[PDB]
Amino acid sequence: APSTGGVIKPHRYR
Amino acid sequence: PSCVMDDFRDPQRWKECAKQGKMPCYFDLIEENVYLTERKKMQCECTPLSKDERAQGEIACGEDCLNRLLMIECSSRCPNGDYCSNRRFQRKQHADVEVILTEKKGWGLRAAKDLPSNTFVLEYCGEVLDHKEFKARVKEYARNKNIHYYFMALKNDEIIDATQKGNCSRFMNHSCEPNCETQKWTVNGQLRVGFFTTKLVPSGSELTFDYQFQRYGKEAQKCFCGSANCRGYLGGENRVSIRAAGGK
Ligand SMILES: Nc1ncnc2c1ncn2[C@@H]1O[C@H](CSCC[C@H](N)C(=O)O)[C@@H](O)[C@H]1O
Ligand SMILES: [Zn+2]
Ligand SMILES: [Zn+2]
Ligand SMILES: [Zn+2]
């Protein structure tokens, strides 16, 4: 269980 | 401190500037995505501009181009040939941007000229990982106690990782009230992600996008975007599993 980390999720700005 | 994108082309000079704190830490600059594992893998209908239309300033493959409308770039076989304006990713037709040191987010990107709305900034290039490779990198970066994260979901089993290899797009910071967005574009039958402005960005303004970050880490990074509607943390309220963040 990492302390920090994640994934950016592309999406269209609304 | 700030630097221009041409400063990243000389690794020896860059490494020396980095030691003096005038440039960010070195990474491998790449021109297109590098797949750790290769995967299994279209003319528009625009009427070619005449030489007079080209001289008069008409745009080839502009807003009515069928490829552009579907976020597909043209190839060298485009009916407009050399003049096609819909080959921005391939021709590296980047916006005029500088890399700057921010107060508490690390380095970032800023506009060096006024950027009109819907201007291509840069492609988010990196190493493309499958789920197995992603989990290996998750562990490596946690073990190394990395602060910044550079994973971006491209498809369900393709994650772009710009930690070790990428371009200056890896410096775009998150904002809860951003001025850029991702767009997914097809280039030679393969998907890429680029950043595009969503409004007129005045010269000197930091370029930001909304990460919609899927946080698997136990601890959330506080957000320093400064927006009146700031969510407080990159990732928001919820922690997700590593599997969910990686797209199942
Ligand atoms: N709004 C924000 N608030 C706090 N940290 C941010 C932020 N936007 C980006 N970051 C930092 O930048 C990382 C994304 S990579 C963006 C480039 C990074 N600033 C660098 O110096 O290389 C995040 O993991 C976080 O550490
Ligand atoms: Zn066209
Ligand atoms: Zn074209
Ligand atoms: Zn914020």
Side-chain angles (χ1 to χ4, degrees), chain B residues 76 97 120 129 142 161 181 213 232-233 235:
Chain B
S76 60
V97 302
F120 173 59
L129 315 177
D161 178 6
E181 64 172 350
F213 194 66
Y233 299 91

Side-chain angles (χ1 to χ4, degrees), chain A residues 7-11, chain B residues 172-175 209-213 234:
Chain A
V7 176
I8 297 162
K9 177 163 296 324
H11 72 288
Chain B
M172 191 172 295
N173 287 315
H174 166 79
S175 178
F209 75 113
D210 178 353
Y211 287 9
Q212 286 292 316
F213 194 66
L234 266 52

Side-chain angles (χ1 to χ4, degrees), chain B residues 14-56:
Chain B
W14 172 4
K15 283 169 182 175
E16 267 306 305
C17 291
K19 292 208 231 301
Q20 307 165 24
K22 299 171 175 176
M23 280 184 74
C25 297
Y26 178 83
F27 60 91
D28 290 327
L29 178 68
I30 60 179
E31 298 304 294
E32 68 184 289
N33 291 342
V34 174
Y35 279 75
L36 258 55
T37 300
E38 291 298 338
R39 328 290 184 85
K40 321 153 181 266
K41 272 172 159 206
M42 48 148 289
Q43 252 170 289
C44 72
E45 300 183 358
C46 292
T47 299
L49 299 187
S50 68
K51 281 163 158 59
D52 266 285
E53 301 175 297
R54 168 56 186 196
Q56 291 164 13

Side-chain angles (χ1 to χ4, degrees), chain B residues 50-73:
Chain B
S50 68
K51 281 163 158 59
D52 266 285
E53 301 175 297
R54 168 56 186 196
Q56 291 164 13
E58 301 301 322
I59 304 304
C61 295
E63 53 189 9
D64 300 321
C65 176
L66 267 59
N67 278 343
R68 178 188 296 276
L69 284 163
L70 292 182
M71 293 191 287
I72 299 169
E73 289 212 332

Side-chain angles (χ1 to χ4, degrees), chain A, chain B residues 149 151 153 181-182 210-214 216-219:
Chain A
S3 37
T4 176
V7 176
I8 297 162
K9 177 163 296 324
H11 72 288
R12 298 304 306 274
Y13 176 64
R14 290 186 172 272
Chain B
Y149 275 80
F151 294 131
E181 64 172 350
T182 52
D210 178 353
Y211 287 9
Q212 286 292 316
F213 194 66
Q214 305 299 302
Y216 59 72
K218 279 176 164 152
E219 299 179 56

Side-chain angles (χ1 to χ4, degrees), chain B:
Chain B
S2 69
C3 53
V4 299
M5 276 177 309
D6 281 344
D7 291 330
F8 296 82
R9 284 192 71 255
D10 180 353
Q12 286 195 30
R13 180 184 184 265
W14 172 4
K15 283 169 182 175
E16 267 306 305
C17 291
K19 292 208 231 301
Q20 307 165 24
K22 299 171 175 176
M23 280 184 74
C25 297
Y26 178 83
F27 60 91
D28 290 327
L29 178 68
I30 60 179
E31 298 304 294
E32 68 184 289
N33 291 342
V34 174
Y35 279 75
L36 258 55
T37 300
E38 291 298 338
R39 328 290 184 85
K40 321 153 181 266
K41 272 172 159 206
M42 48 148 289
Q43 252 170 289
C44 72
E45 300 183 358
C46 292
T47 299
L49 299 187
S50 68
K51 281 163 158 59
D52 266 285
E53 301 175 297
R54 168 56 186 196
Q56 291 164 13
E58 301 301 322
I59 304 304
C61 295
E63 53 189 9
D64 300 321
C65 176
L66 267 59
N67 278 343
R68 178 188 296 276
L69 284 163
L70 292 182
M71 293 191 287
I72 299 169
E73 289 212 332
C74 298
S75 77
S76 60
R77 293 177 185 248
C78 175
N80 279 306
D82 297 306
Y83 297 94
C84 178
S85 72
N86 188 35
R87 306 192 70 207
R88 290 169 295 178
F89 282 80
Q90 292 165 84
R91 295 189 174 284
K92 315 300 284 188
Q93 291 174 329
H94 307 152
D96 192 2
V97 302
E98 289 163 345
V99 178
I100 55 162
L101 179 62
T102 75
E103 288 188 3
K104 38 185 180 286
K105 302 172 304 197
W107 292 76
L109 292 183
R110 74 167 173 205
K113 320 195 161 99
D114 285 5
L115 305 181
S117 192
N118 206 23
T119 297
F120 173 59
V121 180
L122 290 159
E123 175 181 353
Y124 194 83
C125 290
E127 295 176 282
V128 181
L129 315 177
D130 69 9
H131 288 120
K132 194 168 288 187
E133 293 157 339
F134 166 68
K135 283 178 294 187
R137 297 278 176 102
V138 166
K139 176 188 186 166
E140 174 180 355
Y141 300 155
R143 193 176 59 237
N144 292 349
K145 301 185 175 59
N146 284 4
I147 292 180
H148 302 311
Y149 275 80
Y150 304 89
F151 294 131
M152 181 186 289
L154 180 60
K155 307 173 183 171
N156 62 283
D157 61 350
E158 291 193 12
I159 298 169
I160 302 171
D161 178 6
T163 308
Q164 306 176 43
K165 308 190 178 179
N167 67 20
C168 288
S169 61
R170 72 198 284 285
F171 297 115
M172 191 172 295
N173 287 315
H174 166 79
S175 178
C176 302
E177 152 187 9
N179 58 18
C180 294
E181 64 172 350
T182 52
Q183 293 180 16
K184 291 168 174 172
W185 279 72
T186 300
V187 178
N188 289 321
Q190 195 147 51
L191 202 66
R192 299 180 187 204
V193 174
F195 292 132
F196 292 75
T197 63
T198 57
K199 63 168 116 185
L200 202 169
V201 179
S203 187
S205 303
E206 183 172 6
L207 292 169
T208 62
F209 75 113
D210 178 353
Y211 287 9
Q212 286 292 316
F213 194 66
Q214 305 299 302
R215 168 181 55 100
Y216 59 72
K218 279 176 164 152
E219 299 179 56
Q221 164 75 58
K222 286 189 182 187
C223 183
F224 305 125
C225 80
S227 301
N229 301 101
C230 185
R231 307 156 193 168
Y233 299 91
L234 266 52
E237 151 160 7
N238 305 326
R239 179 182 174 205
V240 302
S241 67
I242 291 162
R243 173 207 36 101
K248 275 218 159 197

